[PDB]
Amino acid sequence: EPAKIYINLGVQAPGPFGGGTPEEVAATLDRVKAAAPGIGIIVDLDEGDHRLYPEGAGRYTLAEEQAIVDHAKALGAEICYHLNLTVFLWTWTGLHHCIPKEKLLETLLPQKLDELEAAFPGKLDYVYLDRLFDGRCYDLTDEEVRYVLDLIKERGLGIKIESTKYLDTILESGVKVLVDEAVKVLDPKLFEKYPDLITVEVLYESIETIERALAAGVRNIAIHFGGVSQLDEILDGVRAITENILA
């Protein structure tokens, strides 16, 4: 069967350097689908008594986040939610302070996951956490990894990982994975053992980036462009898929 194609798209709140309101994000997503027809869309999103007005620009409110997802979900786009606040604020410093491993496994991570699916019921496909990131914080044991994967698979979520440190246990757990290769290594043996589970995000440098990927297994490839400014920059290479075919 032919392979799948997606346009990995980053969305953030209006701030000092860019961003767009839920109306602007909705219009851009409609303009991408208007050009790219049979191409999937992967929208990345960062997390923002609980607001209505954003406490400081550069972050969305929970309503604006829901308004974007509900519009992107209606377009058929998959949502990948970034739970970076798992290291946010020992405190009163804005650092990436790491709570004890128990405090995170026992309480916060299930807490954040419950809050997650409470705000976006069944409308999130992948979730990103800065824990499997080559270890960094905490050295995860054998059962510790598969416990976090169980919390994610419980709520029907996939995972986005930057490091392929634990990829050889994620696929055994049968959970969909999103490998961000937009600047480790991986053998094509995985694509014949787990074809419908891996989706590789690549930095678009040319058609040679796709051909090098399609030469292996990669039946699910997401394209992330370098560069609301990017509306037209993506509308340049959006014709790079009508003629690409390659199926």
Author numbering: 3 to 50, 58 to 59, 61 to 99, 116 to 209, 220 to 263, 267 to 286
Pull verbatim passages from the article behind this deposition.
Here, we present a strategy for the de novo design of a simplified scaffold of an endo-α-N-acetylgalactosaminidase active site, a glycoside hydrolase from the GH101 enzyme family. Of 11 tested designs, six were expressed as soluble monomers, displaying similar or increased thermostabilities compared to the natural enzyme. Despite lacking detectable enzymatic activity, the experimentally determined crystal structures of a representative design closely matched the design with a root-mean-square deviation of 1.0 Å, with most catalytically important side chains within 2.0 Å.
dEngBF4 crystallized in two different space groups, P212121 (form 1) and P61 (form 2), and the crystal structures of the protein were determined using the molecular replacement method described in Materials and Methods. Form 1 has two protein molecules, 1A and 1B, in the asymmetric unit, whereas for form 2 one protein molecule is present in the asymmetric unit, resulting in three separate structures. All three structures aligned with an RMSD of 1.0 Å or less, revealing a common (β/α)8-barrel organization with an overall fold similar to the hallucinated model. Likewise, another extended loop region including His91-Lys127 harboring the two tryptophan residues, making up the tryptophan lid in EngBF, displayed both low pLDDT confidence scores and flexibility in the molecular dynamics simulation. The movement of this loop, however, is constrained due to the formation of a disulfide bond between Cys124 and Cys163 residues, potentially contributing to the observed high thermostability in dEngBF4. While ProteinMPNN proved to be highly effective in improving the pLDDT confidence score, certain loop regions remained unrecoverable, which correlated with regions displaying poor or no electron density in the crystal structure.
